Amino acid sequence: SPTKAIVRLREHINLLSKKQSHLRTQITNQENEARIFLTKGNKVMAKNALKKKKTIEQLLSKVEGTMESMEQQLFSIESANLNLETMRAMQEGAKAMKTIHSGLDIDKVDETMDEIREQVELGDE
Numbered sequence: 001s002p003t004k005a006i007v008r009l010r011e012h013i014n015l016l017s018k019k020q021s022h023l024r025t026q027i028t029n030q031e032n033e034a035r036i037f038l039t040k041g042n043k044v045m046a047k048n049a050l051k052k053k054k055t056i057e058q059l060l061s062k063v064e065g066t067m068e069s070m071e072q073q074l075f076s077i078e079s080a081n082l083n084l085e086t087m088r089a090m091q092e093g094a095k096a097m098k099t100i101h102s103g104l105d106i107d108k109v110d111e112t113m114d115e116i117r118e119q120v121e122l123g124d125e
Contacts, residue, residue: 009074030049
């Protein structure tokens with residue numbers, strides 16, 4: 001059903017947003033590791049922590065790309081649900097507009113109407 005798909009996009013999105021949260025802390029700690037490495041004058045291990053900081057940032061990027069893909073899929077489902085809610089409402093309204101137009105067991109009117117049309121409409125070809 002559309003709603004099982006809905007709940008699941010939300011569960012996966014929620015999960016990703018704290019992957020996001022965890023990664024950012026990890027980026028913050030690589031930043032702090034490289035600084036401490038410089039305070040011992042080890043520029044190389046400070047450079048290495050910076051390279052590792054960059055890989056975590058790329059991973060974060062791809063975590064946010066997954067989230068966004070899921071959020072747009074979610075919007076499309078709920079937008080399509082509202083559109084279906086409209087169509088069913090119009091289909092039920094047209095049936096109701098038909099009962100009202102057939103609201104005369106008596107008499108004769110609507111095909112008296114339909115060939116007064118043909119006289120008026122006859123001015124066209």
